[PDB]
Amino acid sequence: MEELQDDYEDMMEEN
């Protein structure tokens, strides 16, 4: 059960 992968943090978004 993962939302995010590895090198990220859901306080930004890769648009």
User: How far apart are alpha carbons 1 and 15 in whole angstroms?
Assistant: 23
**CA dist 8 to 11, 14, Å?**
9, 9
Q: Angle at CA 2, nearest 5°, toward 14 and 13? A: 15
Dihedral of CA atoms 9, 12, 1, 7 in degrees, nearest 10, equals -40
Are 11 and 5 in contact by the 8 Å Cβ rule? The answer is no
Measured distance between the N- and C-terminal CA atoms of the chain, rounded to whole angstroms: 23
Are 3 and 10 in contact by the 8 Å Cβ rule? The answer is yes
CA dihedral sign, ordered 2, 4, 15, 11: positive
